[PDB]
Each structure stands twice: as C-alpha cells, then as structure tokens.
RNA sequence: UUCUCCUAAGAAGCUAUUAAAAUCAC
RNA sequence: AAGUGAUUUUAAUAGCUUCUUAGGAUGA
C-alpha cells in the first residue's frame, strides 16, 4: 500500500544524504568518490524557445537549457530533509528550473553548487552578463 | 522491480502531484506524464495544502566516500569493540488515517534496559518543506504484541527523547569505549528508526577536547565526546552490526533460548535488545580466548593483573610448602608458565587444548565433574581461571564472581559475564553449587625472606618470624601492607579464591 | 536431389514483465 | 477497506536460440 517514488539506483545516495549533518557538502563529496549522480529527475517537454531564467513558474528555456521540475533538483526535497535557508522554505519547490544542457545529466548537483543572480535573472556565470 | 519502498508516498490521496513540487518522475500523476517526459497543462493548477506521509523504510548504508566512515562493520572489527556494544530494538506502530502503508517507531529500547517511548511522528510533505509532525497511528493488529495497545497514549515528543538517548549512551559508554556499536537483529525497521537520532559525517573531533567526536548538537553546531555531551541531540557516527546476517535461521526468541535461559519478556522493546546482544556476545566469544586480540587499557589493568599474579604465586607456594604435595596438577593455562619455578612438584600441564606450542609437553584434557570425579586423586589440581561446572575436593580455585558490575565486567551470556582485561574471558555463572567440595581462603602472608633491620603493625594474619616476636620489622611491615593492598584490590576487582577442605593455616607455623 | 535465405506453424529453454499461491524474517 | 519486506509455484505476455513442418527464390 502506497505509491512508490524512488528507483533503486538512487537508493544508496539518498540513504546517505538522509543521515548527514550537511547534506550539501556530503553530496559534493559523493560524486568525487566515483559515485554516480542523482537520476530519475523530472524533465519537461518544453519548446526550447523561451526566456531562459533560473526559476520561473512556467517552462521557459533557450535552445541550450532544459527546464526541469524544481523540486526534483533541490537535493533536500529529494531526500526529504530540512532546508537550510531561513524559515525552511524551498525556493525551488513549485517553480520550474532551467539547467544548461552541458550539465543536464545531474541537475541535482547543478543547483547545489551554482547560484541564481539577482538582477540578471539568470544562472550566475552561465549567462550572467553583468558587464 | 524497478522501484523501492524508500520514500514511497504513503498518503491515501488518489491523484499524484504537479510537475513541480514532485520529488521524482514516478510521482507525477498520469495526467501529466506523456512520452517519458512530463508536460505542463494550465488546465489544472499545482496544490497549495496537502500532506503526504513518507515511508523512511528500506535505507541502504552501502555507500562509500573518501572520508566518511561506514556504519555496518563485520564481526572481526565488531569483536574488537566489545566494550561498546549496545543492543537496539525498536518496536513500532502503523499509520491509520489519511495515511496507510508505513511503520514508524514507537518504543525504543537499548541493552541498558531503557525503554524510551516516543510519539508516532513521520515526515509529512507540505507543499513547501518536508515537515516532521504527528501522524495518527494504529497499534499493530494481533495479540503477541498486545502490550502496545495502552502505550500509544503515553509518549514523548522526539526532541525530548533524542536527548534521553545521548544522556543514556553517554552514561554507559562514557568510561568503556569511545564509540557505539548498535548490535541490532532485524537491520530493517532499526534503520527507519535511526533516521530520528543519528547523523553521520567525516570523522571529526570533540570540541574542547581531543577524543573522537561521537555526539552532535543542532543548537550549537558542535560535536563532543561522551563526557562533554551535555544536552546534545544526535549521535554522531555510530557503527552497527547485524546479527541475523551471521547466519541464524528463525526468529530471535527461538534462536536465543537455545543457549540462554535467563532473558525473558521477549516481545517488549528492551528485552529483545538484551537478547539481541546476548546472542551476539555468546556465539562470538563463548568458546575461545582468541589471545591474539589485544585490548586497550581502560583503567587499573596493569595493577589488577600484577596483583593477581602476585597472589597466585603466593597461595600455591604456601599450599605446596605446607602440605608437601607430591605432584601438582594444572588445568587451563595456555602456555607452560610455571608460577612457582622453585618447587619440587611435577607440573603436569593438563591444558584444555594445545595452544601454539609443544615445547613443554602440555597435555590435552577437558574437565567435567561427572567424567573426572575419580581420575585425579593424587596431589592438588590448580584450577586457575577454569570454567568447570564443579571442582574436585583437592584444588586451589580462583573463579571470577560474575555478580559484580564494573567497567571491566561487561554483561554476558547465560548469567555469565565477559571480563575484558587485556583479553576477553567469558566466565560462566557464579553459582554456590560449584564449591560444595571447597571452602573460602583466609587472608595471610608467608615469606621465607630473612629479616633485615613507620607505624607498628600487630596482625596475626602475617606469617613472619619478626611478627612472631614482640617487635615487627620494617623489612616485613611494608611487604604485609603491599600484599594487603593487592589482595583487597583483587577482591574488589571480583575474583574469589577457594581452597580444599583440609587447608590448615597452623601447619605453616611448624615449618619455621 | 543438395545449399543458403526469407514467411508461417509446433516444440523446449533463457531472460524481461503481469497476476495470484505459499513460506520465512520483521 | 487497505502494516514492511525476502524467496519460492503457476498462469498470462514479450524478446531470442535450437529443432521440426510447409511455402518462396537463388545456385549444382
Ligand atoms: Ca527489529
Ligand atoms: Ca523487538
Ligand atoms: Zn527544496
Ligand atoms: Zn547580472
Ligand atoms: Zn571531549
Ligand atoms: Zn540470554
Ligand atoms: Zn623481618
């Protein structure tokens, strides 16, 4: 009884960021030890012709991004632990995220290490042209 | 099967979730999934109020990372940390209303005999963050676990029973070892129930100290050893062994009672934790003294062993030089180490089994009373640290009294206890029926060393020509007091000397 | 008549999926 | 109304091998 929501490939990296004091730094280091990054993420069938921003309520990406399901990428909403930012709310859960396809094999590692630029509205560094 | 029962949504809501606010792909309902990739439809919006209990059952700690020390250890490094075994059994309830298909821990019990009774809580999934709140439970249907029915009403919130644990481990394991090795049987629902009080991470060090860090604290993000862990929530990096993967078939109560018969309310949450390590202790230590595995020094290890060797070198020489025994038997010494080399008796080594040497012609023999009641009739048999059920009528026994509890004497199987002092001796239960043929030993000191030339001591227990006279010499007063210190320290350590019926302390006097 | 290949049929097996039946641990 | 798994048996289905049968065509 109960709908299942996890595949056995992640069963050994979610059960290791679950028990961890800081599961951000404890997942950066999991990849370095030859492990494989988190899969089974949500991938949206957008049109690849949209204003590519980090977080938006509707799938909007360029020809080189790929809009994912926001929650799917927040590692914390993916191993069901507490979010570290004040008040404990996820800035992703509920809003589509668009990852550069250069790294779209493991978005869950992208959002953990990159950062959204405030006024440029895009992924700081991967399009943040703040010259 | 392509799935797992881990984080399996346990709600009773029919439909799935929106593309966003969906953890994985298998969780987006069939209204959105089209051609292996989800699509957004503005016809239906995302949710704003909902809660979906999450089943944290089926954790797999088979990871490995370059710094992170692993939990599950294998016997040979579980047998080296035997001072830090804590049985662990958690008995749990179910989920009933608007949530079905999951267990969640209710009563926890460790081998310290400590039932803690948490409240049924579980990680629900608000549309913003994975919460941690009460969920309505239902005691397990049946009768063998009937005691769980009136217990679902008298619990504690977790953050008040996460600190009862660390204030309980850090009382037992405070002065035995520097880690915790949960000796758990199922391995199943005992990792669903460690998500709530265990963190892990790279091996860090006690703040304010230098021992290994084995506690955490979400208030002041800082670690501690067992000593400086006052008011600390989580255990740090606990190791844990799984006992039924050592190859046991059948439930616990019928896999334990094959050996021990004094562990008994076998379905509560803490007598199923004492059976969980009384069965790990037994079939890991019961039948050998590995010798090869040294142990760290907790305290008094040198002095207790030195006092034991002194008193053993003492009493056997006294008995031999008193009763003029022609031959002396020996049982249970691994090598051939003659305790009194300056003797006339023939040291026939009736060892239990040959141990790594044949240089001294040690014999192989096992001792039982009904078998060897009339085999040894000549001389005296030295049963130093022997484990026989009953001792013969001519012997010098030193048996460890297993009813004394200390940081050395860990609890063991079948009433017997594990005395881990530089080695692991599994002495069986200390019963009075074993000493029906013997008596206790009086305190005394006898030496043939000539007297040489401060508080005057007058005690008839000391046997020296100087104290026989009016004035006691300073070449025997300090010897008497040091021997008294050794004797009392050993007796407090827990050994118990026994001697044959005809032992007369006066027979030593006429030797002078 | 022989060889190869193709189409179909029948057989047995392998692995994959679905359903129920039983057992064990929890 | 529906506790968690693990391995078992059969049935239903798909994929593939071999064997047999029939058909077609090539070549001697
Ligand atoms: Ca269990
Ligand atoms: Ca139990
Ligand atoms: Zn999140
Ligand atoms: Zn910018
Ligand atoms: Zn410390
Ligand atoms: Zn027992
Ligand atoms: Zn003297």
PDB file of N, CA and C in Angstrom, chain A residues 1-8 11-12 14-16 18-21 25-26 29-30 33 40-45 58-59 69-72 77-81 83 88-90 93-96, chain B residues 1-4 6-9 18-27 34 37-40 46 59-65 68 101 125 127-130 191 194-195 198-200 204 216 236:
ATOM      1  N   UNK A   1       0.825  -1.199   0.000  1.00  0.00           N
ATOM      2  CA  UNK A   1       0.000   0.000   0.000  1.00  0.00           C
ATOM      3  C   UNK A   1       0.862   1.253   0.000  1.00  0.00           C
ATOM      4  N   UNK A   2       0.562   2.176  -0.906  1.00  0.00           N
ATOM      5  CA  UNK A   2       1.319   3.405  -1.005  1.00  0.00           C
ATOM      6  C   UNK A   2       2.049   3.517  -2.321  1.00  0.00           C
ATOM      7  N   UNK A   3       1.946   4.668  -2.974  1.00  0.00           N
ATOM      8  CA  UNK A   3       2.646   4.892  -4.232  1.00  0.00           C
ATOM      9  C   UNK A   3       4.147   4.992  -4.000  1.00  0.00           C
ATOM     10  N   UNK A   4       4.927   4.317  -4.838  1.00  0.00           N
ATOM     11  CA  UNK A   4       6.374   4.393  -4.721  1.00  0.00           C
ATOM     12  C   UNK A   4       6.915   5.563  -5.530  1.00  0.00           C
ATOM     13  N   UNK A   5       8.006   6.159  -5.035  1.00  0.00           N
ATOM     14  CA  UNK A   5       8.574   7.304  -5.737  1.00  0.00           C
ATOM     15  C   UNK A   5      10.098   7.287  -5.799  1.00  0.00           C
ATOM     16  N   UNK A   6      10.750   6.139  -5.672  1.00  0.00           N
ATOM     17  CA  UNK A   6      12.202   6.124  -5.744  1.00  0.00           C
ATOM     18  C   UNK A   6      12.676   4.833  -6.390  1.00  0.00           C
ATOM     19  N   UNK A   7      13.659   4.957  -7.277  1.00  0.00           N
ATOM     20  CA  UNK A   7      14.219   3.840  -8.033  1.00  0.00           C
ATOM     21  C   UNK A   7      15.492   3.356  -7.353  1.00  0.00           C
ATOM     22  N   UNK A   8      15.859   2.084  -7.488  1.00  0.00           N
ATOM     23  CA  UNK A   8      16.984   1.533  -6.720  1.00  0.00           C
ATOM     24  C   UNK A   8      18.353   2.092  -7.071  1.00  0.00           C
ATOM     25  N   UNK A  11      18.780   4.640  -4.439  1.00  0.00           N
ATOM     26  CA  UNK A  11      18.564   4.100  -3.106  1.00  0.00           C
ATOM     27  C   UNK A  11      19.800   4.111  -2.232  1.00  0.00           C
ATOM     28  N   UNK A  12      20.982   4.368  -2.776  1.00  0.00           N
ATOM     29  CA  UNK A  12      22.191   4.329  -1.972  1.00  0.00           C
ATOM     30  C   UNK A  12      22.867   5.677  -1.827  1.00  0.00           C
ATOM     31  N   UNK A  14      20.525   8.571  -1.649  1.00  0.00           N
ATOM     32  CA  UNK A  14      19.545   9.252  -0.822  1.00  0.00           C
ATOM     33  C   UNK A  14      19.625   8.770   0.613  1.00  0.00           C
ATOM     34  N   UNK A  15      19.896   7.491   0.806  1.00  0.00           N
ATOM     35  CA  UNK A  15      20.081   6.942   2.134  1.00  0.00           C
ATOM     36  C   UNK A  15      21.443   7.266   2.720  1.00  0.00           C
ATOM     37  N   UNK A  16      22.174   8.193   2.136  1.00  0.00           N
ATOM     38  CA  UNK A  16      23.453   8.664   2.647  1.00  0.00           C
ATOM     39  C   UNK A  16      23.481  10.165   2.803  1.00  0.00           C
ATOM     40  N   UNK A  18      20.459  11.407   3.573  1.00  0.00           N
ATOM     41  CA  UNK A  18      19.450  11.458   4.620  1.00  0.00           C
ATOM     42  C   UNK A  18      20.101  11.602   5.986  1.00  0.00           C
ATOM     43  N   UNK A  19      20.941  10.637   6.367  1.00  0.00           N
ATOM     44  CA  UNK A  19      21.790  10.746   7.552  1.00  0.00           C
ATOM     45  C   UNK A  19      23.030  11.563   7.217  1.00  0.00           C
ATOM     46  N   UNK A  20      22.942  12.872   7.361  1.00  0.00           N
ATOM     47  CA  UNK A  20      24.141  13.678   7.183  1.00  0.00           C
ATOM     48  C   UNK A  20      23.898  15.055   7.746  1.00  0.00           C
ATOM     49  N   UNK A  21      24.903  15.578   8.444  1.00  0.00           N
ATOM     50  CA  UNK A  21      24.757  16.841   9.143  1.00  0.00           C
ATOM     51  C   UNK A  21      24.602  17.985   8.162  1.00  0.00           C
ATOM     52  N   UNK A  25      27.468  19.430   1.370  1.00  0.00           N
ATOM     53  CA  UNK A  25      28.860  19.012   1.313  1.00  0.00           C
ATOM     54  C   UNK A  25      29.023  17.506   1.321  1.00  0.00           C
ATOM     55  N   UNK A  26      28.032  16.766   1.788  1.00  0.00           N
ATOM     56  CA  UNK A  26      28.105  15.319   1.796  1.00  0.00           C
ATOM     57  C   UNK A  26      27.595  14.711   0.507  1.00  0.00           C
ATOM     58  N   UNK A  29      30.943  15.509  -2.184  1.00  0.00           N
ATOM     59  CA  UNK A  29      31.986  14.515  -1.997  1.00  0.00           C
ATOM     60  C   UNK A  29      31.570  13.123  -2.424  1.00  0.00           C
ATOM     61  N   UNK A  30      30.277  12.845  -2.552  1.00  0.00           N
ATOM     62  CA  UNK A  30      29.879  11.527  -3.026  1.00  0.00           C
ATOM     63  C   UNK A  30      30.225  11.336  -4.488  1.00  0.00           C
ATOM     64  N   UNK A  33      33.996  10.517  -5.193  1.00  0.00           N
ATOM     65  CA  UNK A  33      34.417   9.142  -4.966  1.00  0.00           C
ATOM     66  C   UNK A  33      33.776   8.208  -5.978  1.00  0.00           C
ATOM     67  N   UNK A  40      16.572  10.122 -12.254  1.00  0.00           N
ATOM     68  CA  UNK A  40      15.131   9.986 -12.146  1.00  0.00           C
ATOM     69  C   UNK A  40      14.492  11.357 -12.013  1.00  0.00           C
ATOM     70  N   UNK A  41      15.219  12.425 -12.321  1.00  0.00           N
ATOM     71  CA  UNK A  41      14.678  13.766 -12.184  1.00  0.00           C
ATOM     72  C   UNK A  41      13.515  13.985 -13.143  1.00  0.00           C
ATOM     73  N   UNK A  42      12.816  15.102 -12.949  1.00  0.00           N
ATOM     74  CA  UNK A  42      11.714  15.449 -13.835  1.00  0.00           C
ATOM     75  C   UNK A  42      12.210  16.328 -14.979  1.00  0.00           C
ATOM     76  N   UNK A  43      11.871  15.926 -16.199  1.00  0.00           N
ATOM     77  CA  UNK A  43      12.308  16.643 -17.388  1.00  0.00           C
ATOM     78  C   UNK A  43      11.082  17.078 -18.171  1.00  0.00           C
ATOM     79  N   UNK A  44      11.015  18.360 -18.494  1.00  0.00           N
ATOM     80  CA  UNK A  44       9.822  18.932 -19.091  1.00  0.00           C
ATOM     81  C   UNK A  44       9.938  18.963 -20.609  1.00  0.00           C
ATOM     82  N   UNK A  45       8.824  18.678 -21.287  1.00  0.00           N
ATOM     83  CA  UNK A  45       8.756  18.760 -22.748  1.00  0.00           C
ATOM     84  C   UNK A  45       8.378  20.179 -23.171  1.00  0.00           C
ATOM     85  N   UNK A  58       6.754  28.784 -15.252  1.00  0.00           N
ATOM     86  CA  UNK A  58       6.379  28.059 -16.451  1.00  0.00           C
ATOM     87  C   UNK A  58       7.626  27.705 -17.249  1.00  0.00           C
ATOM     88  N   UNK A  59       7.673  26.513 -17.851  1.00  0.00           N
ATOM     89  CA  UNK A  59       8.910  26.068 -18.502  1.00  0.00           C
ATOM     90  C   UNK A  59       9.339  26.992 -19.627  1.00  0.00           C
ATOM     91  N   UNK A  69      11.920  19.935 -13.168  1.00  0.00           N
ATOM     92  CA  UNK A  69      10.946  20.201 -12.156  1.00  0.00           C
ATOM     93  C   UNK A  69      11.677  20.689 -10.964  1.00  0.00           C
ATOM     94  N   UNK A  70      11.395  21.890 -10.541  1.00  0.00           N
ATOM     95  CA  UNK A  70      12.130  22.471  -9.461  1.00  0.00           C
ATOM     96  C   UNK A  70      12.417  21.641  -8.285  1.00  0.00           C
ATOM     97  N   UNK A  71      11.468  20.884  -7.833  1.00  0.00           N
ATOM     98  CA  UNK A  71      11.698  20.185  -6.621  1.00  0.00           C
ATOM     99  C   UNK A  71      12.603  19.146  -6.974  1.00  0.00           C
ATOM    100  N   UNK A  72      12.415  18.597  -8.136  1.00  0.00           N
ATOM    101  CA  UNK A  72      13.276  17.461  -8.407  1.00  0.00           C
ATOM    102  C   UNK A  72      14.739  17.793  -8.198  1.00  0.00           C
ATOM    103  N   UNK A  77      14.605  18.465  -1.052  1.00  0.00           N
ATOM    104  CA  UNK A  77      13.300  17.924  -1.410  1.00  0.00           C
ATOM    105  C   UNK A  77      13.403  16.579  -2.088  1.00  0.00           C
ATOM    106  N   UNK A  78      14.602  16.060  -2.237  1.00  0.00           N
ATOM    107  CA  UNK A  78      14.845  14.818  -2.932  1.00  0.00           C
ATOM    108  C   UNK A  78      15.266  13.711  -1.986  1.00  0.00           C
ATOM    109  N   UNK A  79      15.772  14.059  -0.806  1.00  0.00           N
ATOM    110  CA  UNK A  79      15.991  13.123   0.280  1.00  0.00           C
ATOM    111  C   UNK A  79      15.147  13.454   1.499  1.00  0.00           C
ATOM    112  N   UNK A  80      14.293  14.471   1.410  1.00  0.00           N
ATOM    113  CA  UNK A  80      13.317  14.838   2.434  1.00  0.00           C
ATOM    114  C   UNK A  80      13.986  15.138   3.769  1.00  0.00           C
ATOM    115  N   UNK A  81      14.790  16.195   3.768  1.00  0.00           N
ATOM    116  CA  UNK A  81      15.396  16.742   4.967  1.00  0.00           C
ATOM    117  C   UNK A  81      15.110  18.234   5.003  1.00  0.00           C
ATOM    118  N   UNK A  83      15.449  22.243   4.817  1.00  0.00           N
ATOM    119  CA  UNK A  83      16.151  23.228   4.023  1.00  0.00           C
ATOM    120  C   UNK A  83      16.915  24.180   4.933  1.00  0.00           C
ATOM    121  N   UNK A  88      12.949  27.757   6.559  1.00  0.00           N
ATOM    122  CA  UNK A  88      12.784  26.434   5.991  1.00  0.00           C
ATOM    123  C   UNK A  88      11.754  26.360   4.881  1.00  0.00           C
ATOM    124  N   UNK A  89      11.974  27.117   3.813  1.00  0.00           N
ATOM    125  CA  UNK A  89      11.164  27.057   2.610  1.00  0.00           C
ATOM    126  C   UNK A  89      12.067  26.823   1.414  1.00  0.00           C
ATOM    127  N   UNK A  90      11.565  26.077   0.450  1.00  0.00           N
ATOM    128  CA  UNK A  90      12.329  25.755  -0.741  1.00  0.00           C
ATOM    129  C   UNK A  90      12.013  26.812  -1.780  1.00  0.00           C
ATOM    130  N   UNK A  93      10.789  24.399  -4.945  1.00  0.00           N
ATOM    131  CA  UNK A  93       9.638  23.515  -4.981  1.00  0.00           C
ATOM    132  C   UNK A  93       8.410  24.295  -5.399  1.00  0.00           C
ATOM    133  N   UNK A  94       7.966  24.082  -6.629  1.00  0.00           N
ATOM    134  CA  UNK A  94       6.826  24.785  -7.176  1.00  0.00           C
ATOM    135  C   UNK A  94       7.137  25.648  -8.375  1.00  0.00           C
ATOM    136  N   UNK A  95       8.407  25.865  -8.704  1.00  0.00           N
ATOM    137  CA  UNK A  95       8.798  26.755  -9.783  1.00  0.00           C
ATOM    138  C   UNK A  95       9.819  26.065 -10.672  1.00  0.00           C
ATOM    139  N   UNK A  96       9.564  26.065 -11.977  1.00  0.00           N
ATOM    140  CA  UNK A  96      10.400  25.334 -12.928  1.00  0.00           C
ATOM    141  C   UNK A  96      11.820  25.886 -12.896  1.00  0.00           C
TER     142      UNK A  96
ATOM    143  N   UNK B   1      12.262  -5.049 -10.326  1.00  0.00           N
ATOM    144  CA  UNK B   1      11.068  -4.437  -9.759  1.00  0.00           C
ATOM    145  C   UNK B   1      11.062  -2.946 -10.071  1.00  0.00           C
ATOM    146  N   UNK B   2      12.260  -2.404 -10.277  1.00  0.00           N
ATOM    147  CA  UNK B   2      12.498  -1.045 -10.752  1.00  0.00           C
ATOM    148  C   UNK B   2      12.118   0.017  -9.724  1.00  0.00           C
ATOM    149  N   UNK B   3      11.557  -0.376  -8.581  1.00  0.00           N
ATOM    150  CA  UNK B   3      11.153   0.556  -7.535  1.00  0.00           C
ATOM    151  C   UNK B   3      11.830   0.168  -6.226  1.00  0.00           C
ATOM    152  N   UNK B   4      11.520   0.937  -5.187  1.00  0.00           N
ATOM    153  CA  UNK B   4      11.950   0.648  -3.830  1.00  0.00           C
ATOM    154  C   UNK B   4      10.884   1.167  -2.880  1.00  0.00           C
ATOM    155  N   UNK B   6      11.414   2.906  -0.440  1.00  0.00           N
ATOM    156  CA  UNK B   6      12.044   4.035   0.222  1.00  0.00           C
ATOM    157  C   UNK B   6      11.401   5.318  -0.264  1.00  0.00           C
ATOM    158  N   UNK B   7      11.090   6.212   0.666  1.00  0.00           N
ATOM    159  CA  UNK B   7      10.363   7.437   0.363  1.00  0.00           C
ATOM    160  C   UNK B   7       9.105   7.167  -0.443  1.00  0.00           C
ATOM    161  N   UNK B   8       8.519   5.985  -0.316  1.00  0.00           N
ATOM    162  CA  UNK B   8       7.282   5.722  -1.027  1.00  0.00           C
ATOM    163  C   UNK B   8       6.137   6.475  -0.376  1.00  0.00           C
ATOM    164  N   UNK B   9       5.563   7.404  -1.126  1.00  0.00           N
ATOM    165  CA  UNK B   9       4.420   8.176  -0.673  1.00  0.00           C
ATOM    166  C   UNK B   9       3.384   7.267  -0.031  1.00  0.00           C
ATOM    167  N   UNK B  18       1.698  17.758  -9.011  1.00  0.00           N
ATOM    168  CA  UNK B  18       2.042  18.640 -10.115  1.00  0.00           C
ATOM    169  C   UNK B  18       3.423  18.290 -10.651  1.00  0.00           C
ATOM    170  N   UNK B  19       3.795  18.735 -11.852  1.00  0.00           N
ATOM    171  CA  UNK B  19       5.189  18.543 -12.276  1.00  0.00           C
ATOM    172  C   UNK B  19       6.180  19.151 -11.307  1.00  0.00           C
ATOM    173  N   UNK B  20       6.080  20.448 -11.037  1.00  0.00           N
ATOM    174  CA  UNK B  20       6.797  20.989  -9.900  1.00  0.00           C
ATOM    175  C   UNK B  20       6.249  20.366  -8.626  1.00  0.00           C
ATOM    176  N   UNK B  21       6.931  20.625  -7.518  1.00  0.00           N
ATOM    177  CA  UNK B  21       6.606  20.029  -6.226  1.00  0.00           C
ATOM    178  C   UNK B  21       6.362  18.529  -6.329  1.00  0.00           C
ATOM    179  N   UNK B  22       7.035  17.882  -7.264  1.00  0.00           N
ATOM    180  CA  UNK B  22       7.081  16.441  -7.327  1.00  0.00           C
ATOM    181  C   UNK B  22       8.501  15.988  -7.072  1.00  0.00           C
ATOM    182  N   UNK B  23       8.733  15.092  -6.130  1.00  0.00           N
ATOM    183  CA  UNK B  23      10.105  14.669  -5.838  1.00  0.00           C
ATOM    184  C   UNK B  23      10.803  14.057  -7.036  1.00  0.00           C
ATOM    185  N   UNK B  24      10.230  13.009  -7.616  1.00  0.00           N
ATOM    186  CA  UNK B  24      10.846  12.323  -8.740  1.00  0.00           C
ATOM    187  C   UNK B  24       9.845  12.198  -9.874  1.00  0.00           C
ATOM    188  N   UNK B  25      10.207  11.386 -10.866  1.00  0.00           N
ATOM    189  CA  UNK B  25       9.376  11.209 -12.048  1.00  0.00           C
ATOM    190  C   UNK B  25       8.203  10.273 -11.786  1.00  0.00           C
ATOM    191  N   UNK B  26       8.454   9.182 -11.060  1.00  0.00           N
ATOM    192  CA  UNK B  26       7.413   8.195 -10.799  1.00  0.00           C
ATOM    193  C   UNK B  26       6.269   8.763  -9.976  1.00  0.00           C
ATOM    194  N   UNK B  27       6.408   9.990  -9.491  1.00  0.00           N
ATOM    195  CA  UNK B  27       5.411  10.578  -8.616  1.00  0.00           C
ATOM    196  C   UNK B  27       4.477  11.549  -9.320  1.00  0.00           C
ATOM    197  N   UNK B  34       3.618  12.193 -20.367  1.00  0.00           N
ATOM    198  CA  UNK B  34       3.388  11.860 -21.768  1.00  0.00           C
ATOM    199  C   UNK B  34       4.727  11.715 -22.472  1.00  0.00           C
ATOM    200  N   UNK B  37       8.493  11.942 -20.590  1.00  0.00           N
ATOM    201  CA  UNK B  37       8.860  13.233 -20.021  1.00  0.00           C
ATOM    202  C   UNK B  37       7.582  13.996 -19.720  1.00  0.00           C
ATOM    203  N   UNK B  38       7.534  14.646 -18.563  1.00  0.00           N
ATOM    204  CA  UNK B  38       6.313  15.300 -18.128  1.00  0.00           C
ATOM    205  C   UNK B  38       6.063  16.572 -18.933  1.00  0.00           C
ATOM    206  N   UNK B  39       4.793  16.973 -18.979  1.00  0.00           N
ATOM    207  CA  UNK B  39       4.356  18.180 -19.664  1.00  0.00           C
ATOM    208  C   UNK B  39       3.490  18.969 -18.692  1.00  0.00           C
ATOM    209  N   UNK B  40       3.518  20.292 -18.830  1.00  0.00           N
ATOM    210  CA  UNK B  40       2.679  21.177 -18.030  1.00  0.00           C
ATOM    211  C   UNK B  40       1.377  21.401 -18.773  1.00  0.00           C
ATOM    212  N   UNK B  46      -1.180  23.579  -9.571  1.00  0.00           N
ATOM    213  CA  UNK B  46      -0.497  22.872  -8.508  1.00  0.00           C
ATOM    214  C   UNK B  46      -1.263  23.020  -7.199  1.00  0.00           C
ATOM    215  N   UNK B  59      16.350   1.777   4.110  1.00  0.00           N
ATOM    216  CA  UNK B  59      17.583   2.520   3.953  1.00  0.00           C
ATOM    217  C   UNK B  59      18.723   1.565   3.657  1.00  0.00           C
ATOM    218  N   UNK B  60      19.642   2.011   2.803  1.00  0.00           N
ATOM    219  CA  UNK B  60      20.764   1.168   2.404  1.00  0.00           C
ATOM    220  C   UNK B  60      22.050   1.954   2.620  1.00  0.00           C
ATOM    221  N   UNK B  61      22.756   1.643   3.698  1.00  0.00           N
ATOM    222  CA  UNK B  61      24.018   2.307   4.006  1.00  0.00           C
ATOM    223  C   UNK B  61      25.202   1.551   3.417  1.00  0.00           C
ATOM    224  N   UNK B  62      25.127   1.222   2.130  1.00  0.00           N
ATOM    225  CA  UNK B  62      26.228   0.566   1.440  1.00  0.00           C
ATOM    226  C   UNK B  62      27.085   1.561   0.681  1.00  0.00           C
ATOM    227  N   UNK B  63      27.037   2.823   1.075  1.00  0.00           N
ATOM    228  CA  UNK B  63      27.794   3.861   0.399  1.00  0.00           C
ATOM    229  C   UNK B  63      29.277   3.641   0.647  1.00  0.00           C
ATOM    230  N   UNK B  64      30.103   4.498   0.059  1.00  0.00           N
ATOM    231  CA  UNK B  64      31.487   4.645   0.484  1.00  0.00           C
ATOM    232  C   UNK B  64      31.994   5.954  -0.093  1.00  0.00           C
ATOM    233  N   UNK B  65      32.616   6.764   0.750  1.00  0.00           N
ATOM    234  CA  UNK B  65      33.149   8.046   0.321  1.00  0.00           C
ATOM    235  C   UNK B  65      34.521   8.194   0.963  1.00  0.00           C
ATOM    236  N   UNK B  68      34.226   9.554   4.798  1.00  0.00           N
ATOM    237  CA  UNK B  68      33.073   9.143   5.582  1.00  0.00           C
ATOM    238  C   UNK B  68      33.252   7.714   6.082  1.00  0.00           C
ATOM    239  N   UNK B 101       0.199   2.328   4.929  1.00  0.00           N
ATOM    240  CA  UNK B 101       1.306   1.690   4.259  1.00  0.00           C
ATOM    241  C   UNK B 101       2.658   2.157   4.733  1.00  0.00           C
ATOM    242  N   UNK B 125       4.910  15.811   3.851  1.00  0.00           N
ATOM    243  CA  UNK B 125       5.406  16.668   2.775  1.00  0.00           C
ATOM    244  C   UNK B 125       4.456  17.823   2.517  1.00  0.00           C
ATOM    245  N   UNK B 127       3.535  21.450   0.909  1.00  0.00           N
ATOM    246  CA  UNK B 127       3.935  21.954  -0.407  1.00  0.00           C
ATOM    247  C   UNK B 127       5.080  22.948  -0.364  1.00  0.00           C
ATOM    248  N   UNK B 128       5.767  23.079   0.765  1.00  0.00           N
ATOM    249  CA  UNK B 128       6.923  23.951   0.888  1.00  0.00           C
ATOM    250  C   UNK B 128       8.158  23.237   1.415  1.00  0.00           C
ATOM    251  N   UNK B 129       7.994  22.323   2.362  1.00  0.00           N
ATOM    252  CA  UNK B 129       9.130  21.724   3.033  1.00  0.00           C
ATOM    253  C   UNK B 129       8.684  20.454   3.731  1.00  0.00           C
ATOM    254  N   UNK B 130       9.582  19.479   3.782  1.00  0.00           N
ATOM    255  CA  UNK B 130       9.264  18.192   4.380  1.00  0.00           C
ATOM    256  C   UNK B 130       9.262  18.301   5.895  1.00  0.00           C
ATOM    257  N   UNK B 191      16.724   0.836  11.031  1.00  0.00           N
ATOM    258  CA  UNK B 191      17.294   1.980  10.331  1.00  0.00           C
ATOM    259  C   UNK B 191      16.262   2.995   9.894  1.00  0.00           C
ATOM    260  N   UNK B 194      16.574   4.975  13.064  1.00  0.00           N
ATOM    261  CA  UNK B 194      17.770   5.731  13.367  1.00  0.00           C
ATOM    262  C   UNK B 194      17.836   7.017  12.585  1.00  0.00           C
ATOM    263  N   UNK B 195      16.992   7.198  11.583  1.00  0.00           N
ATOM    264  CA  UNK B 195      16.918   8.496  10.946  1.00  0.00           C
ATOM    265  C   UNK B 195      16.622   9.585  11.961  1.00  0.00           C
ATOM    266  N   UNK B 198      20.293   9.841  14.602  1.00  0.00           N
ATOM    267  CA  UNK B 198      21.657   9.568  14.176  1.00  0.00           C
ATOM    268  C   UNK B 198      21.995  10.478  13.017  1.00  0.00           C
ATOM    269  N   UNK B 199      23.147  11.123  13.098  1.00  0.00           N
ATOM    270  CA  UNK B 199      23.757  11.820  11.985  1.00  0.00           C
ATOM    271  C   UNK B 199      25.021  11.058  11.656  1.00  0.00           C
ATOM    272  N   UNK B 200      25.606  11.302  10.490  1.00  0.00           N
ATOM    273  CA  UNK B 200      26.913  10.760  10.147  1.00  0.00           C
ATOM    274  C   UNK B 200      27.689  11.827   9.403  1.00  0.00           C
ATOM    275  N   UNK B 204      35.121  13.724  12.837  1.00  0.00           N
ATOM    276  CA  UNK B 204      35.547  14.966  13.454  1.00  0.00           C
ATOM    277  C   UNK B 204      35.924  14.713  14.908  1.00  0.00           C
ATOM    278  N   UNK B 216      26.373  15.113  18.481  1.00  0.00           N
ATOM    279  CA  UNK B 216      26.131  16.294  17.674  1.00  0.00           C
ATOM    280  C   UNK B 216      25.227  17.237  18.450  1.00  0.00           C
ATOM    281  N   UNK B 236      26.580  11.044  16.733  1.00  0.00           N
ATOM    282  CA  UNK B 236      27.362  11.161  15.516  1.00  0.00           C
ATOM    283  C   UNK B 236      27.627  10.194  14.386  1.00  0.00           C
TER     284      UNK B 236
END
